[PDB]
């Protein structure tokens, strides 16, 4: 560790702790910068040499964390929790958590190499028949093919290609992860991840929210399944069974907006999927980012800096390069560089993704002057919800009209149902998946799910929550969890479930603040500078204050609450119920064992 990056001496008291944190800050920014830069060089240009550089950057970060972590303990262990400066308690709190820096060097190198290889396997996997990548090829097939066999080929090929090779590495990762966080005093890595919400009743709180949301999901499910039956027939759709996992428009069945064309109740109202118009009008990636930016400046939030437009990767490279395509927003921790890396396609759902990612950037811009340790969301759910909140306004027919993507506007009950259904396919359908992923991982971390039940426990949860089944037989050679990015990339998931609740709480608060008086799902906060100021206050706080308090100041409540989401969707909730009753549907999938047959001519 460079002389310049090592900790010196400070008095063992609060005034010295302030001096400590300031000195940490100065060297931390240099260490984070080099680490994020090496990650960037790799992820926008995957090569062995880039990987080796990234691995060395990670080791350097571990060394830093160890020196400053050990020093924070040495000087402040008896007294940090009693400090008068609450920001300073949070900073010391973060600095003394060593994580992977608790590993001896040899396990460090093994841990870093495992992360690097899991990521390289996920992002370079291909399905060959001439090889299809996940982005754009397999995404497009899953989104717009309607051929059972083609969808099955893409689904099965992806799951096999990414998942199977990941399993030995993921087992070794899990062991070392646990070994690391056990030395910081947690039972397993999952306990550590859960501690970020600082809520003794976290798991119970989540389960109480899910119980209120599940009826909506059950009703959406029944309706969609019925629509699928009418297209695919009773051989491949069981009206009392789970839905085959390849038919819902997405590789993970995680959101269903791409099958909107199959379920839309009133098809001679305005077409609410504007992808065509976007293509017809010749939208490019850059237009999508500029349109998102302009929403943000309409609120008197910050524009993207020059360094964002010069630095970002906003399209998949056409040169020789292999890249990580999964969309991400990057803070280089130097108060100056911020970038998005996305293999942007010209679709409506990607317009939302652009907003999601710009939400991350906007947070980075607003809190960049805080101490590095506080440069994060009030909780991880907050960071994931910013961009989605704006995208709720953008997707309203009224707003789409204003930006030239919808000629006709209508304000009638049929158009509303169409709109709310489209939104339920995006939002309601995700809830079970958003909940289940970390249940899987918590079980793996705690040892409840050993390697010998990875796929068994995955599909138990996928069926339990989502009501889907694999369209071909799976066994424990398969590692279907590892065919989802966040798993080999070691990115927590529960944040997305929290996000999907939070974003409706935020939407209701910002619509109220903007003076809007109509139904929640028709609110557009565009150009509301009052809404901007309320949102800006959250962003600027970073993690400096308890998330419960930040939320209370924003929405008038100190807890996650499903009531705003329920109110948003009220009309379609009522309507789907009535439709399912009228059609004689069974809610749920009591034939839980059912799986579809293979096609006759398959794979050939």
Ligand X SMILES: *[C@@H]1O[C@H](CO[C@@H]2O[C@@H](C)[C@@H](O)[C@@H](O)[C@@H]2O)[C@@H](O[C@@H]2O[C@H](CO)[C@@H](O[C@@H]3O[C@H](CO)[C@@H](O)[C@H](O)[C@@H]3O)[C@H](O)[C@H]2NC(C)=O)[C@H](O)[C@H]1NC(C)=O
Ligand Y SMILES: *[C@@H]1O[C@H](CO[C@@H]2O[C@@H](C)[C@@H](O)[C@@H](O)[C@@H]2O)[C@@H](O)[C@H](O)[C@H]1NC(C)=O
Ligand Z SMILES: *[C@@H]1O[C@H](CO)[C@@H](O[C@@H]2O[C@H](CO)[C@@H](O)[C@H](O)[C@H]2NC(C)=O)[C@H](O)[C@H]1NC(C)=O
Ligand U SMILES: C[C@H](N[C@@H](CCc1ccccc1)C(=O)O)C(=O)N1Cc2ccccc2C[C@H]1C(=O)O
User: Per the annotation, where are the binding residues?
Assistant: 197, 356, 360, 384, 495
Strand partners, 331: 338
| From the list ligand X, ligand Z, Zn ion, none, partner contacted by residue 384 (C-beta under 5 to 8 A by kind) | Zn ion
Residue 190 as a binder of Cl ion (CB under 5 A): the answer is no
SS (H, E, C) 465-485: HHCEECCCCCCCCCCHHHHCC
Residue 284 as a binder of ligand Y (CB under 6 A): the answer is no
Rounded Cα distance between 404 and 277, Å, is 9
How remote is the C-alpha of 167 from its chain's centroid?
22
Rounded Cα distance between 58 and 119, Å, is 14
Sort strands 243-244 and 131-132 into parallel, antiparallel or unpaired. unpaired
| Bond into 507 cis (ω within 30) | no
Sign of the dihedral through C-alpha 295, 297, 299, 302 = positive
Applying CB under 6 A, which of residues 321, 448, 537, 552 lies at the interface with ligand Z? 321
Binding segment for ligand U (CB under 6 A), chosen from 207-215, 267-275, 356-364, 462-470, is: 356-364
Residue 588 as a binder of ligand X (CB under 6 A): the answer is no
SS (H, E, C) 160-199: HHHHHHHHHHHHHHHHHHHHHHHCCCCCCHHHHHHHCCCC
Q: Which of 357, 426, 508, 513 is catalytic?
A: 357
Residue 475 as a binder of ligand Y (CB under 6 A): the answer is yes
| From the list ligand X, Zn ion, Cl ion, none, partner contacted by residue 284 (C-beta under 5 to 8 A by kind) | none
Neighbouring C-beta atoms of residue 340, cutoff 10 Å? 23
Q: How far is the CB of 553 from ligand X (least distance, A)?
A: 25
Rounded Cα distance between 26 and 262, Å, is 55
Residue 491 as a binder of ligand U (CB under 6 A): the answer is yes
Q: How far is the CB of 235 from ligand Y (least distance, A)?
A: 17
Q: Which of residues 487-506 bind Cl ion (CB under 5 A)?
A: 492, 495
486 given a catalytic annotation: yes
Residue carrying the six token digits 């349109």: 291
| Residues that constitute the known binding site for Zn(2+) | 356, 360, 384
| From the list ligand X, ligand U, Na ion, none, partner contacted by residue 496 (C-beta under 5 to 8 A by kind) | ligand U
Applying CB under 6 A, which of residues 34, 50, 178, 238 lies at the interface with ligand Z? 50
357 given a catalytic annotation: yes
Whichever of 344 and 499 has its CB closer to Cl ion, that residue is 499
Strand partners, 313: 341
Q: How far is the CB of 475 from ligand Y (least distance, A)?
A: 4
| Residues that constitute the known binding site for chloride | 197, 495
DSSP summary character for residue 543: T
Neighbouring C-beta atoms of residue 34, cutoff 10 Å? 18
Residue 328 as a binder of ligand U (CB under 6 A): the answer is yes
| Bond into 155 cis (ω within 30) | no
Strand partners, 339: 330
- Report which of 224, 284, 302, 296 is spatially closest to residue 257, judged by C-alpha positions: 224
Q: How far is the CB of 194 from Cl ion (least distance, A)?
A: 8
Window 416-455: contact mask with ligand Y (x via CB under 6 A): ----------------------------------------
Residues of this chain that interact with ligand U (CB under 6 A) are 255, 326-329, 353, 356-357, 360, 384, 430, 489, 491, 496
Known catalytic residues are: 357, 486
Residues of this chain that interact with Cl ion (CB under 5 A) are 380, 492, 495
Residues of this chain that interact with ligand Z (CB under 6 A) are 45, 47, 49-50, 319, 321
Residues of this chain that interact with Na ion (CB under 5 A) are 349
């Amino acid at each position: 560790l460079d002389p310049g990056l090592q900790p010196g001496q400070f008095s063992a008291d609060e005034a010295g702790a302030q001096l400590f944190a300031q000195s940490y800050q100065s060297s931390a920014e240099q260490v984070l910068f080099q680490s994020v830069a090496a990650s960037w060089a790799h992820d926008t240009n995957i090569t062995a040499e880039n990987a080796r550089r990234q691995e060395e950057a990670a080791l350097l970060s571990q060394e830093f964390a160890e020196a400053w972590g050990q020093k924070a303990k040495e000087l402040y262990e008896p007294i940090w929790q009693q400090f008068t400066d609450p920001q300073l308690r949070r900073i010391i709190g973060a600095v003394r958590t060593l994580g992977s820096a608790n590993l001896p060097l040899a396990k460090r190198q093994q841990y870093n190499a495992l992360l690097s290889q899991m990521s390289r396997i996920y992002s370079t996997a291909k399905v060959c028949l001439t090889c299809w990548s996940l982005d754009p090829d397999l995404t497009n097939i899953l989104a717009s093919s309607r051929s059972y066999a083609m969808l099955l080929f893409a689904w099965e090929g992806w799951h096999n290609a990414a998942g199977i090779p990941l399993k030995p590495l993921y087992e070794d990762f899990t062991a070392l992860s646990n070994e690391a966080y056990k030395q910081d005093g947690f039972t397993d890595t999952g306990a550590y991840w859960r501690s970020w919400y600082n809520s003794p009743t976290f798991e119970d709180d989540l389960e109480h929210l899910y119980q209120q949301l599940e009826p909506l999901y059950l009703n959406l499910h029944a309706f969609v399944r019925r629509a699928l039956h009418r297209r695919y027939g009773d051989r491949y759709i069981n009206l009392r069974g789970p839905i085959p996992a390849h038919l819902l428009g997405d590789m993970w069945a995680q959101s269903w907006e791409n099958i909107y064309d199959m379920v839309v109740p009133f098809p001679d109202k305005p077409n609410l999927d504007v992808t065509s118009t976007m293509l017809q009008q010749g939208w490019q990636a850059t237009h999508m980012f500029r349109v998102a930016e302009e929403f943000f400046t309409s609120l008197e939030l910050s524009p993207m800096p020059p360094e964002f437009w010069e630095g970002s990767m906003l399209e998949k490279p056409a040169d020789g390069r292999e890249v990580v395509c999964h969309a991400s927003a990057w803070d280089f921790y130097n108060r100056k560089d911020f970038r998005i890396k996305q293999c942007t396609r010209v679709t409506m759902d990607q317009l939302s993704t652009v907003h999601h990612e710009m939400g991350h950037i906007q947070y980075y811009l607003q809190y960049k002057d805080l101490p590095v340790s506080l440069r994060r969301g009030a909780n991880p759910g907050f960071h994931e919800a910013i961009g989605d909140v704006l995208a709720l306004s953008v997707s309203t027919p009224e707003h789409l009209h204003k930006i030239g993507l919808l000629d006709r506007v209508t304000n009638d009950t049929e158009s509303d149902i169409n709109y709310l259904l489209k939104m339920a396919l995006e939002k309601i359908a995700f809830l079970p998946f958003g909940y289940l992923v970390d249940q899987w991982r918590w079980g793996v971390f705690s040892g409840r799910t050993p390697p010998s039940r990875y796929n068994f426990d995955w599909w138990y949860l996928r069926t339990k929550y989502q009501g889907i089944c694999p369209p071909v037989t799976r066994n424990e050679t398969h590692f279907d969890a590892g065919a989802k990015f966040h798993v080999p990339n070691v990115t927590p998931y529960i944040r997305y479930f929290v996000s999907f609740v939070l974003q409706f709480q935020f939407h209701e608060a910002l619509c109220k603040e903007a003076g809007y008086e109509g139904p929640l799902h028709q609110c557009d906060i565009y150009r509301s500078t009052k809404a901007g100021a309320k949102l800006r206050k959250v962003l600027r706080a970073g993690s400096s204050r308890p998330w419960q308090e930040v939320l209370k100041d924003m929405v008038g409540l100190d807890a996650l609450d499903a009531q705003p989401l329920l109110k948003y969707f009220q009309l379609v909730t009522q309507w789907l119920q009535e439709q399912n009753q009228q059609n004689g549907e069974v809610l749920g999938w009591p034939e839980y064992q059912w799986h579809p047959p293979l096609p006759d001519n398959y794979p050939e």
